[PDB]
Structure formats: C-alpha cells, structure tokens
Design a protein around this ligand. Structure first.
Ligand SMILES: *[C@@H]1O[C@H](CO)[C@@H](O[C@@H]2O[C@H](CO)[C@@H](O[C@@H]3O[C@H](CO)[C@@H](O)[C@H](O)[C@@H]3O)[C@H](O)[C@H]2NC(C)=O)[C@H](O)[C@H]1NC(C)=O
Ligand code: NAG
Ligand code: NAG
Lengths: 231, 118, 132, 231
C-alpha cells in the first residue's frame, strides 16, 4: 500500500567472528507485482540471490537480495545506496547506510551471588551487566575456566536505552545459574562482551570466591570467670 | 490503658496562640462544639485498647495538631497531625439535597471497586 | 558500635555497625561490623528434660540471624500496601539455643497418687511462669 | 486471509494497585466494519460497550469490546465466555479465560553496587533480580528513603523464561543509578515486587551502605557457665 521506511544492516554475530558479511537493504510498499529495480553502486563481482516471497498482511509481497561484499568497504565509510524505482511516483525517501559515528564503549560489571542462596546448597546465580554503549548491537557469551558454555544454559535479555542527560546510551544484562558445589570448589566463571566501538572487539571479567574478601579480622574468645555482659 | 476502661474520653485541638490551650471539641458524654456541627463524632469501637473519631468535610485550614486524653489516673496523651494533600474523594454523593412537600426523596452514594468487600 | 542491625534472642547474637569517615582521601573510609555470641555450656539440644546430651555444636548463619519477617507499610502512589520483608520464614521449626527471659517453658510429667496417675505440669524457668 | 478470535487477560497494574479488572475480547480478520455482536455468559452489569473499529492490514476492520467488572470473582476462579456473531462468518466461535493455577512465588534479591564503580565518585548502580515465578506478569517499583522515585529514573527489562530445571519458570531485572554522595552519606533504597502468588501480594527488600560488604569485622565469642537465659 503506502511506502514506508525500513533498514537492515550486516549482522554483528558474523562480523566479529567470521568474514561472512552479507548486506541486505530494504524498501517496501506493495501495490504492484515484480517491477524490480536495484541500486548496488558497488557491484564488484557480486551476484544477488533472489528467492520466493513469504507471508505478509493478507496479499501483499516484498522483495530483497544479498551482496557478499566483505572486502572491508563497510567499516571504511562507503554509503551503499538504497533507492527503489517502479512505474509509479518518482519520489522516494531513501536509505543510505554506513558505519555510524559518535560511538562509545560499554562498561562491564560482573556481580557475586547473594548470600541467601549460598546457605541453602542448591544452584547459585551470577549476573553480568553492561551499560553505556552507543549503538544497540552487542554479543554476550559465558565461560567456565576456558570452556565456552553452550548457549542454551543461560538467559539474556534484549538491549534497551537508558534515561540520560543529552547523549543516548544503552544497556543489557544476562544471568547464569551454576551448582553450589562448583562454586565452593574454586572454579571460576567469566562473561564476554562483543561490541564494535571496542578496539579489540572483546572484554572479559572473571569472578570466584576470595574476590570481595575483607582484609581485617579480630577474634576474641572470652573464657569463663570473666563474664561482663551489658544489657 | 485497658485497666482504665470506665473513663471519659475527650478530643482537643491545639491552638498554639497564647501559650498553648485545648478547646475541647467532643466528649464521651454527648456534647460537641457549635461550629463543628454535622462533621464530628466519637465512637467507642473497637474498644479494649482504642477508640476512634470521625472528622469529614475537610478543608485546607483543618491541618494542625490534635490531642486525645482520658479521665483515668495514668494519662498518655497522644498527638496526630492531619495533613491536607490534593486529590479526589472516593465515595460520591450529590450536593445539598432539598425535599418536596408531599412526596418521597431518594439519595444515591457510589463507591469504587476496592471497597467491594467492605 | 552505634547502630543496631539485629538483636536476636533465640540464638542470642547481636550485630552492630558504624561508618567512621576520614576527611582526607575521600575515596577510602572504613565500615565496621561487630558480632557478639554468648555460648551456653549447659543447655540440651531440644529443650525438654531427657532429650540428648549437652549441645556441643553451635551454628550461626548470617542470613538467618538478620531475617526480618513482620509486615510493613509502603506508600506507593496514594495507597498503603502491606509488604513482607523476607523470602525465608515459612511457618515453630527453629531450634533455639537459649531461653528467652520474657517467655516461659513448661514440661509434663506423670506421677502417682495412690491409685491412678495424673498429668502434673512443671515449670522449667520459674521467674516467668507466674499466672497473673 | 482469515478471521480469528483472541482473548487477552487483564493487566497486572490495575488489578493490584486498584481493583477495576476490565476485560477485552478481540477478533481480527474482517473487512466490513458495521456488523458485530458479542455475548458473555455471566452478565449482571451487562452493559459491555464495544470499541472502535480501528486500523488493520491497510485499513481493514478489526473490532473488540470491554466488559467492566472488578476483581472479586477473578481471584476465586470464575470463567468468562465471550463469543462473536459477525456476518462475515457462518459460525459463532468461543474461547474462555480463567485465573491460572500451578503458580510459584518469586525470590527477590538486591545486589550492592560494584566496588570499581565507587572509586570514581560519579554515579552508582543498584540491581534488582526476581526469579522463579510461574505466570508471565510482574511489577517493579523503586523508593528512596520512604519516597517513591518517579518512573522515568529507572530502566526495567521484560519477563522471559529461564532454562528448564523440570518445570517452567520466569525471570526479570531492573537497574537504578543514584548519586555517589548520598550512597556514602547513608540514605536507603528499596526495591518492591508484586506478583499473584505471594500471600500479601507484595514483598520488599531494603539496602543501604551499612548492610553491605564491610571492611572490618570484630568477632567476640563469650562462653557462659552461668545460665542459658540470654538477658
Ligand atoms: C522437644 O521435646 C518436646 C517434649 O517432648 C516435644 O514436644 C512434644 O512432643 C510430643 C511427642 O510427640 C508430642 O506429643 C503429643 O502430646 C499430646 C498431649 O499434648 C498427645 O495428646 C499426643 O497424642 C502426642 O503424644 C507433643 O505434641 C509435643 N508438644 C507439646 C507437648 O507441646 C517436641 O516435639 C520436641 N522437639 C523436637 C524437635 O524433637
Ligand atoms: C541518503 O538518503 C537520505 C534520505 O533523506 C538523505 O537524507 C541523505 O542525504 C542520503 N545520502 C546522501 C549521501 O545523499
Ligand atoms: C474452556 O476452555 C477449555 C479448553 O480451552 C474447553 O473445555 C472449552 O473451550 C471451554 N469450556 C467451557 C466450559 O467454557
């Protein structure tokens, strides 16, 4: 029906680990059939796949395609033009996608368990937290010693923005529940965070016991024949 | 005090003008002040440690400090402060209802849904 | 030693704490926590008479000393709601280590009076079981 | 396309803080916005007024209604039986709703701020974690001293389900950033959580600087041959 505004960038979960970056840009508005027109102004040896449509709001269709151009033009600042055309009105609002600027780093904290859960001998719980990062894309993984845990042992919420003073920032949490015998053995755990405003793309924090231990302890044993209790 | 249950109960209003003074407003024996007519009463329930007093039709000048006092030998005097903040009354009644000469009247009174078990 | 965090009487433990702040170097202060335990050397494990030997092992968990469950009042918007303050006090079943000076403790013993036997009641702390 | 009928539950906020438990009844997937009639099987305050035929897939018809009636029968386990009889179908169809059983009550924990965030003297973070509850509805408020903070000063995530230890349970989190001056001075902060399985429907946790990790610990054990009465 009426044309709208839509955006789709490359995926971070494949941009930080592998080099299988795929661009896929969107512009919709469905009244007519296939009248396909592109803008891929760098097209340096890429062939755009197209496929079948899928389900939409009871009759309408929408189209897109993929360019595999991971030769670092995206984190340089190419603008990668997106603009439709049809036998229709030649007045688009356009999409021009690039690596964005004014980026900030996250600040990561890893919290110890509550002392109520320790004195019950069941599973205990840990909490990761990151806040202050400027685009809302982030990855969170857990480790045990050096082994990465499978990603169906832990829960991670989404990425939401904060109340602030002018500059806008974002935050995210996650939890992991382990057994109390593993905590009281002395095994360590870690939270890893990936983001694109970090220079080495990863940060770590690690926790165990003996981390927030106090540094001074006075023990006095008062024997018999010396009781002096006051009310 | 429970051991002084055959006493006589009073309700002050702390004036604070000269040095300090209780004009009495209502007693346990059936007297009330003139200018507080239709908006004050003292109730003996629940009893056994405690009586209650009801003061409605509030205005913003009704804020102040209020005292209660018994007639027995040991006297605790207890003070409560009535503040006035803005909002809406829960129960809802009409204005000042007249009467016809020679037929009936009927007056409604709503309530909200947290009062559905009271 | 200024602000009392807990003063418990089933286990007879008391915990106070205090902030004592230096003005120079405002990044570091000290926070003190004082604990006092009084160990009874002549009480039984269950509190009746013939139970078991002297209790010889005494265990204190900080999360059960500081536990607070009597309800409170919170004002949210213009409302008074009643809230609980703890996860763990499901009703007792707590084992007490000492007596409490304002509660009294009795036992039941059978004795004979020539014919059949009665169900004589006996005070265990006589200062507190006076009927008045 | 396809017309269906769906039924939503009452919201948690007006059920606890108030009692006005208005219900609703939604069918979607028609295109003729004049013919619709609904019917409930218990109807004493029967005046259920229908809602506007608002927007749909490119401006189609989609209508719902509301039955007023407050929260005494919903807690005892009644039933409600909305059905629709629109002229774009040849069948009246029905669903129902009931306050669910098989519920569990949550465990609330407040976590003290991290140590590294206090060394900079700008702002500090408090975290509220509530866990192990069987429905998908929860509330989180914050208080300073005895004064409730306004809702735009803290960020709360959504309710999601956690990995399976047999039966399904859920979780939620919340954060609040306060000034590092009145933390060190000694103000108190509270996290309140409301859910349907708790007996008084609310529970609270309060924290301040004294009730956290101390730096010094003094232990005094006094052995008493005298008596076991604890004056
Ligand atoms: C610690 O010791 C006390 C004293 O023996 C225990 O309290 C009592 O335990 C008895 C034994 O089961 C209970 O007996 C019941 O007595 C009633 C008469 O009141 C009788 O009709 C019943 O048929 C039954 O035999 C009794 O309920 C109980 N409580 C009292 C007398 O108040 C206590 O259970 C012991 N605690 C532990 C943890 O071992
Ligand atoms: C990309 O499209 C937007 C749409 O308004 C426009 O504002 C922007 O200037 C375009 N980029 C360039 C380089 O023209
Ligand atoms: C209520 O729902 C159940 C299962 O969804 C089913 O028996 C039927 O749809 C309804 N029954 C009654 C009596 O409302």
């Amino acid at each position: 029906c009426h044309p709208r505004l839509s955006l789709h960038r490359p995926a971070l979960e494949d941009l930080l680990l592998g080099s299988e970056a795929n661009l896929t840009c969107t512009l919709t508005g469905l009244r007519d059939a296939s009248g396909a027109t592109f803008t891929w102004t760098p097209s340096s040896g890429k062939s755009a796949v197209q496929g079948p449509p899928e389900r939409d709001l009871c009759g309408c269709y929408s189209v897109s395609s993929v360019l595999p151009g991971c030769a670092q033009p995206w984190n340089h600042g190419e603008t990668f033009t997106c603009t439709a055309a049809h036998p229709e009105l030649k007045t688009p609002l356009t999409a021009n996608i690039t690596k964005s600027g004014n980026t900030f780093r996250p600040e990561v904290h890893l919290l110890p368990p509550p002392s109520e859960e320790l004195a019950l001998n069941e599973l205990v719980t840990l909490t990761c937290l990151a806040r202050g990062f400027s685009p809302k894309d982030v990855l969170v993984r857990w480790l045990q010693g050096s082994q990465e845990l499978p990603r169906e042992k832990y829960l991670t919420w989404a990425s939401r923005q904060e109340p602030s003073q002018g500059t806008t920032t974002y935050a995210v949490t996650s939890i992991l529940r382990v057994a109390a015998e593993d905590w009281k053995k002395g095994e360590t755990f870690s939270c890893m965070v990936g983001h694109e405003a970090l220079p080495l793309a990863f940060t770590q924090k690690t926790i165990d016991r003996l981390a927030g231990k106090p540094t001074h302890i006075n023990v006095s044993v008062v024997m018999a024949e010396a009781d002096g209790t006051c009310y | 005090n429970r051991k002084e249950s055959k006493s006589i109960k009073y309700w002050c209003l702390w004036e604070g003008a000269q040095n300090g003074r209780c004009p009495l407003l209502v007693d346990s024996e059936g007297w009330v002040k003139a200018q507080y007519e239709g908006r004050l009463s003292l109730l003996e329930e629940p009893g056994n440690g405690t009586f209650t007093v009801i003061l409605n039709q509030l205005t913003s000048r009704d804020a102040g400090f209020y005292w209660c006092l018994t007639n027995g030998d040991t006297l605790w005097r207890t003070t409560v402060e009535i503040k006035i903040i803005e909002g809406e009354p829960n129960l809802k009644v009409p204005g000042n209802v007249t009467a016809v000469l020679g037929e009936t009247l009927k007056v409604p009174c709503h309530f909200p849904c947290k009062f559905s078990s009271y | 030693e200024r602000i009392v965090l807990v003063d418990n009487k089933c286990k007879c433990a008391r915990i106070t704490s205090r902030i004592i702040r230096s003005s120079e170097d405002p990044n570091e202060d000290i926070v003190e926590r004082n604990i006092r335990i009084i160990v009874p050397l002549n009480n039984r494990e269950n509190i009746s008479d013939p139970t078991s030997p002297l209790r010889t092992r005494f265990v204190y968990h900080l999360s059960d000393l500081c536990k607070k469950c009597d309800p409170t009042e919170v004002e949210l918007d213009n409302q008074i709601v009643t809230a609980t303050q703890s996860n763990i006090c499901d009703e007792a079943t707590e084992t007490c280590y000492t007596y409490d000076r304002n509660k009294c403790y009795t036992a039941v013993v059978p004795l004979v009076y020539g014919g059949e036997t009665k169900m004589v009641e006996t005070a265990l702390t006589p200062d507190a079981c006076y009927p008045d």
